[PDB]
């Protein structure tokens, strides 16, 4: 917090590593594997560094302090990163990922089938599928399309076999983000 950029990043990596002991409900992976797969799909797609970091860190709220997770984890994680010095763009992509879930479900009921048990279970209490009115305001966000991409990777980052790079692969990216 008053730390150097390098030490702030070491704290984040330590929190990510600790998340391996947190289960991801409904699939044969843990929270660390989930985070890493999301970042991997982002980077492999050719996404910019802010998108990759948002994907890596979208669930940070679950473990920067549950079974299904932390209430309002999307805000907890975004605000923590705001405090550390991350850009508003990254913070908003992360904060928006629950609304993105509600939007996608409201648009096509078929999207429900894509949801893990964890994502499906929290949805009711997060407001369920969006209103027509809610959809309109979400679509008005400047990062509307990017929020949806973050959520697509979120739904995809639950593969059983998949080997992906660990947190150190993103250290330099995070340090540069903070400097920039
Ligand atoms: Fe989440
Ligand atoms: Fe997630």
From Swiss-Prot:
What enzyme class is recorded for this protein? oxidoreductase
What is the regulation of this protein's activity?
Inhibited by EDTA.
Give EC number(s), comma-separated: 1.13.11.78
Q: Which positions does UniProt annotate for Fe cation 2 binding?
A: 59, 73, 97
Q: Name one Pfam family in it.
A: HD
Q: Locate the residues binding Fe cation 1.
A: 24, 34, 58-59, 154
Specify the domain of life of the species encoding this protein. Answer: Bacteria
Outcome reported for the amino acid change (mutating residue 58 to A): Loss of dioxygenase activity
What reaction does this enzyme carry out catalytically? (1R)-(2-amino-1-hydroxyethyl)phosphonate + O2 = glycine + phosphate + 2 H(+)
Q: Cofactors per UniProt?
A: Fe cation
InterPro entries referenced in this protein's UniProt entry, alphabetically: HD/PDEase_dom, HD_domain, HDIG_dom, OP_Dioxygenase
Entry's cofactor comment? Binds 2 iron ions per subunit. During catalysis, PhnZ uses a mixed-valent Fe(2+)/Fe(3+) cofactor.
The effect of residue 62 to A is: 6-fold decrease of the catalytic efficiency and 2.5-fold decrease of the affinity for (R)-2-amino-1-hydroxyethylphosphonic acid
The answer on whether this UniProt entry bears the keyword Cytoplasm reads no
| Record's subunit section | Monomer.
Protein name, entry field? 2-amino-1-hydroxyethylphosphonate dioxygenase (glycine-forming)
Lineage runs: Bacteria, environmental samples
Which gene name belongs to this protein?
Answer: phnZ
């Amino acid at each position: 917090m008053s730390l150097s950029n390098s030490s702030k990043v070491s704290v984040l990596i330590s929190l990510l590593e600790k998340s391996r002991d947190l289960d991801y409900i409904g699939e044969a992976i843990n929270q660390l594997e989930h985070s890493l797969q999301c970042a991997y799909f982002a980077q492999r797609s050719g996404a910019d560094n802010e998108m990759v970091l948002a994907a890596l860190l979208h669930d940070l709220g679950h473990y920067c302090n549950g079974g299904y997770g932390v209430w309002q984890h999307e805000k907890v994680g975004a605000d923590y990163l705001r405090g550390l010095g991350f850009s508003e763009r990254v913070a908003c992509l992360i904060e928006g990922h629950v609304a993105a879930k509600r939007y996608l479900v409201s648009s096509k009921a078929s999207y429900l089938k894509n949801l893990s048990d964890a994502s499906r279970k929290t949805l009711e209490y997060q407001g369920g599928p969006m209103d027509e009115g809610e959809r309109r305001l979400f679509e008005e966000r400047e990062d509307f399309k990017d929020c949806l991409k973050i959520r697509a990777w979120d739904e995809k980052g639950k593969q059983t076999d998949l080997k992906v790079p660990g947190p150190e692969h993103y250290r330099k990216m995070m340090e540069e983000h903070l400097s920039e």
